[PDB]
Amino acid sequence: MSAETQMERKIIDFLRQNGKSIALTIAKEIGLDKSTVNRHLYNLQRSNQVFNSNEKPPVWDLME
């Protein structure tokens, strides 16, 4: 407990800043693989930090 889950949230936040979207974009944003993205979003998902959010295309973005 220090800043573990913070990593997940920071990478999507970068994405968030260019344009939150699906996991496929996140992968391009950070130059990582989509499976990598999946693990990160999965953490935040269950944590109710990240989920699909409010818009018409169910965004992988957050409310924070």
Experimental method: NMR
| CA dist list (Å): 21 to 5, 11, 55 | 19, 12, 11
What is the number of other CB atoms lying within 10 angstroms of the CB of residue 23? 17
> Which residues neighbour 62 within 8 Å (Cβ) at sequence distance 6 or greater?
9, 12, 16, 20, 44, 49, 50, 51, 53
d(CA 64, CA 27): 21
- How far the first Cα of the chain sits from its last, in Å, is 20
3 CB neighbour count, 10 Å cutoff: 8
Long-range (24+ apart) CB contacts under 8 A made by 26-29 are: 26/60
Q: Are 62 and 53 in contact (CB under 8 A)?
A: yes
CATH code at 12? 1.10.10.10
Residue 31 structural domain? 1-64
Number of domains in the chain: 1
**Strand boundaries in the chain, DSSP class E:** 50-53, 59-62
Q: Tell which residue, 42, 24, 45, 21, has the closest CA to residue 33.
A: 24
β-bridge partners, 17: none
